Design a protein around this ligand. Structure first.
Ligand SMILES: [Zn+2]
Length: 258
């Protein structure tokens, strides 16, 4: 009986196994666009994914992760609020059972159909495991997804989901270009926060893009065909695997843009 997104083990229950769930810098949060202040101090954001090397995609019962080779300085995130270099290790989504919900962060309380999370770790800490133990160990790029026109660069991901339907399944996923999942503009909000799943460590600088990418209903429907359960178990569809907005507390959300 571990955490999950069910009525008896959902986000509201996580604090029992992870006290930090009621911490001072938990994520996600609602982004109040009118209160977020433009920060002249923010340097230009740099997303260098030209040499990104994906290797595999796995259903881990919480989402599916496209994993990358981070043994070398290739796909990195720098600039903006960040100091130093952060290396891409994996990306995953959260999505709902309906187009009206699914994102973890909200904008003026608005919930998007889904949210993409590109996870990077601060290279100054040597590895991901050590980085998550640091307040500035991680830097996650958040991108909202809305339903409309299909996203060409996402179809490759959608097509392999059939092979990793259940928890524990993984498949080769080489040569995937994450640049195809980025919106046109890099304008962003940013604030200090946490992982949004156990162990919910407060080691994350969050960079959430203002501009959503559009995906087709067909593409999102395939996300909804995945299973939380393992092979040969009662089917529990993988939907609504998002954590709700948490108290902002003593934090300020800064904007990179007008
Ligand atoms: Zn996430």
């Amino acid at each position: 009986h571990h955490a999950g997104y069910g009525k008896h083990n959902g986000p509201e229950h996580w604090h029992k196994d992870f006290p930090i769930a009621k911490g001072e810098r938990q994520s996600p949060v609602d982004i109040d666009t009118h209160t977020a202040k433009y920060d002249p101090s923010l340097k230009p954001l740099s997303v260098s994914y030209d040499q990104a090397t994906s290797l595999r995609i796995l259903n881990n019962g919480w989402a599916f992760n496209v994993e990358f080779d981070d043994s070398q300085d290739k796909a990195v995130l720098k600039g903006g609020p960040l100091d130093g270099t952060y290396r891409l290790i994996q990306f995953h989504f959260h999505w709902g059972s309906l187009d009206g919900q699914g994102s973890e962060h909200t904008v003026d309380k608005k919930k998007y159909a889904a949210e993409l999370h590109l996870v990077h770790w601060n290279t100054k800490y040597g590895d991901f495991g050590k980085a998550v133990q640091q307040p500035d160990g991680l830097a996650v790029l958040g991108i909202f997804l809305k339903v409309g026109s299909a996203k060409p660069g996402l179809q490759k991901v959608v097509d392999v989901l059939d092979s990793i339907k259940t928890k524990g399944k993984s498949a080769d996923f080489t040569n995937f270009d994450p640049r195809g999942l980025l919106p046109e503009s890099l304008d962003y909000w940013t604030y200090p926060g946490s992982l949004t799943t156990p162990p919910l460590l407060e080691c994350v600088t969050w960079i959430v893009l203002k501009e959503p990418i559009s995906v087709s209903s067909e593409q999102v429907l395939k996300f909804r065909k995945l299973n939380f359960n393992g092979e040969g178990e009662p089917e529990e569809l993988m939907v609504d695997n998002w954590r709700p907005a948490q108290p902002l507390k003593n934090r300020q959300i800064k904007a990179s843009f007008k």
